[PDB]
Amino acid sequence: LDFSKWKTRQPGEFRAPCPAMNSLANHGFIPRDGRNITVAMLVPVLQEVFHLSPELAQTISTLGLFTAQDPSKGVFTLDDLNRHNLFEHDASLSREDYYFHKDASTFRPEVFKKFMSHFKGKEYVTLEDAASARYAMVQESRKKNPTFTYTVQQRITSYGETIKYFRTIVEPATGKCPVAWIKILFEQERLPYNEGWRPPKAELSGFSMASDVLELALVTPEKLID
Amino acid sequence: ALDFSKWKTRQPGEFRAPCPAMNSLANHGFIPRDGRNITVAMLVPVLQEVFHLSPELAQTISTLGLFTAQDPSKGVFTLDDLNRHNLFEHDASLSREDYYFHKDASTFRPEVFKKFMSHFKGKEYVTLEDAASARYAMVQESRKKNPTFTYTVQQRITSYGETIKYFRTIVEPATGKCPVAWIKILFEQERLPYNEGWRPPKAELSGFSMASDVLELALVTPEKLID
Ligand code: HEC
Ligand code: HEC
Ligand SMILES: [Mg+2]
Ligand SMILES: [Mg+2]
C-alpha cells in the first residue's frame, strides 16, 4: 500500500458518488481509470485499506457488481455506481439528488457545506452530530424532491454510509473521526494518510455495523410509526 | 442430512440456556444433548444448516457464546455458561424474568411469556410493528421494576437482534412470515416446529441483512436515547 501514488481524477477516468471508492481509484489501489472492477480484486483491497470483514466486503462489493450494465459478466465500473436508485440514492451527504440536474455523482460544495455545518466548532464527529447531519439531508430531500425515494434498501445504505466514514476515517490512537479528515476524503478523494490516518485497527463487520446502525437510529428523531 | 424426529425435551442432568434456539438445538441433538462441549467449529455449520445464518454472523454469535465461558481459551462452552448474567444473557427478556428478582434469568416464565404473546392476540402472524412493541414493552417493564436494569450498547443490539432472529428464522417456507403458533412452540417446548411445516429458512440471515432489519425494527419502536 503505497499512499504516495495519489493523483486527483483525470479526464476520461470513471468516478462514482462514493468518496471511498473514488479515493481507491485516485490512489491506484483499484484501476485508476475506474474500469475493470471485479469483486475478487476489490474484496482484499477493502479488507486491507478499510479493515472491512471478509463478508461485509464481499457483500458491498457484490452490491456494486449488481449495478453493472451486465452483472452476469462479473465486471463493473465506477460509472456503473452512478446509476440512480440502484446503489446511489437520494438524501446524500455531499451530492445532490439525481432529480435536480440528473447528476448525483459530482461532488457538490453547497451540499457538503450543509452536511459539515452539523459539526461546526468541533474537531471530531460525534454519533449524535452524524445522526443529525444525515437526517437533515433526508428532511431536505423530502421537502424539496417530489421524486424522493427512501425505501428499506435506501435506508440501510444511507445509515451504513454514515457508519462507514464514522468507523473507518478514524485516528489509530483514538478511534475517533476527525472533521478535517472527512473534509479531505470527500473534497480531495484522498485517504488522509499524510495527515496521520491509517487502516482502522478495529474490524468493521456486518454485526458491528448492525450495532452502530442501531445506535445511530436511537439518536435520530426519525420514525416510521407515529 | 438432519434428523428432526430425534427430538426429546430436556432430560435430567442436561444443561440449558436462556436461549430457546440453542435449547432446541440441544433437545434435537443437533449439538450435544447435555448442553456441554460446544465449540465454535461445531456450532457454526449447525447454525448455517438449521437457521441459514451467514458464516460470519454464525461465527460472531458462537464466539460471543464462547466468551461466556469462565476461560474462553479452553475453546469450549456450555449452555450453562450462557446463563451468566450480563455476559450474553440480559434484562428485558421476552420469556424469562430479570436476574434481579430471583437470581434465575434462565428458566422459562409463563407469566413473562404471557405478557410477550399478548402483543399478538388475535393475529396468526407476527408483524415487524408488533414484534417491536412486544420487545419494547419488556424494556419499559424492566426500567420500571428493576433498580439494577442494565441496557448498554451491548445489550441493545443483542435484544434487537434476538427479535430479528425469531422473526426471520421461525418462518413459513411458503411466505417467509412468522407464525405466532410457531413462536409458541419454540419458546414453550424448545422444539423447532418441523412437524408443523417449519423448515430452515430460504433467506440467509447475514450481518448486513440483520443490520437492515434492526434498523427497521428501531424505526417502528418509540425508543430513543435522545429527547
Ligand atoms: C469500504 C469503505 C467505504 C466507505 C468508507 C464508504 N464507502 Fe461508498 N458508496 C457507494 C455508492 C454507490 C455510494 C452512493 C450512495 C449515495 O447516493 O449517497 C456510496 C456512498 C458513500 C458515502 C456517502 C457519500 C454521500 O455523499 O452521501 C460514504 C461516506 C461512503 N460511501 C463511504 C458504493 C460503494 C461500494 C460499491 C462497490 C463500496 C465497496 C463502498 N461504497 C465502500 C465504502
Ligand atoms: C441462530 C439462531 C438463534 C435464534 C433464532 C435465537 N438465538 Fe439466542 N440467545 C442466547 C442467549 C444467552 C440469550 C439470552 C438473552 C436474554 O437474556 O434474553 C438468547 C436469547 C434469545 C432469544 C430471546 C429470548 C428471550 O426470552 O428474550 C431469542 C428469540 C433467541 N435467542 C433466538 C445465546 C445464543 C447463542 C450463543 C452461542 C446463539 C448461537 C444463539 N443464541 C442463536 C439464536
Ligand atoms: Mg446520492
Ligand atoms: Mg435475559
Numbering used by the authors:
A (entry chain A): 2 to 227
B (entry chain B): 1 to 227
Can you list sentences taken from the study reporting this PDB entry?
These enzymes form a group of fungal heme-thiolate peroxidases (HTPs). Hence, they share a proximal cysteine residue acting as the fifth ligand of the heme iron with the phylogenetically distant cytochrome P450 monooxygenases (P450s), present in all living organisms. In the present study, two UPOs from the basidiomycete Marasmius rotula (rMroUPO) and the ascomycete Collariella virescens (rCviUPO) were crystallized after sequence optimization and Escherichia coli expression as active soluble enzymes.
In rCviUPO, the neighbor residues located at the upper side of the cofactor that outline the cavity shell include Leu57, Ile61, His90, Phe88, Gly161, Glu162, and Lys165, with the heme iron coordinated by the thiol side chain of Cys19 at the lower side. The Mg2+-coordinating residues in rCviUPO (at 2.01–2.14 Å) are the same found in rMroUPO, but no acetate was found at the heme pocket. Phe160 of rMroUPO was replaced by Lys165 in rCviUPO and, as a result of this and other amino acid substitutions, the access to the substrate binding site in rCviUPO was narrowed. At the corner of the dimer, Ser54 and Glu56 also bridge the interface by hydrogen bond interactions.
